[PDB]
Amino acid sequence: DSEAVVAVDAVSFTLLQDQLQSVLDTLSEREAGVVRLRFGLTDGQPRTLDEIGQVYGVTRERIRQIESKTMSKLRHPSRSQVLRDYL
């Protein structure tokens, strides 16, 4: 059964969800929220630059810069090593 749930990747996925939540919490609240609504983690829809700008009162260019900085600092060795095994 191809579509059947394997019952182990589900546990891996929920633990990955918890670990990603914790990792996002380690960062600043502003950057964590920017990433969350940019990649659609709270809800299904990944919001757009205009949407995050209009909900955070920040220029779209500044939001792009802070998103890039957040991504670069989230590529940091310890976080990357922690998340590596989940792949």
Partner 1 sequence: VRLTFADIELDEETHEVWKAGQPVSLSPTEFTLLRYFVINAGTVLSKPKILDHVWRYDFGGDVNVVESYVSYLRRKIDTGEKRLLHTLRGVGYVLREPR
The counts of H helices and E strands in the chain are: 5, 0
SS3 67: helix
Task: Establish if 69 lies at the interface with partner 1 (CB under 8 A).
Answer: yes
- Kindly state the DSSP code that residue 6 receives in the 8-state scheme: -
Angle made by CA atoms 14, 18, 19, in degrees to the nearest 5: 115
Q: Which residue among 12, 42, 65, 80 contacts partner 1 (CB under 8 A)?
A: 65
Task: Establish if 46 lies at the interface with partner 1 (CB under 8 A).
Answer: yes
Q: Which is nearer to partner 1, 22 or 48 (CB)?
A: 48
Task: Establish if 76 lies at the interface with partner 1 (CB under 8 A).
Answer: no
Number of chain positions touching partner 1 (CB under 8 A): 11
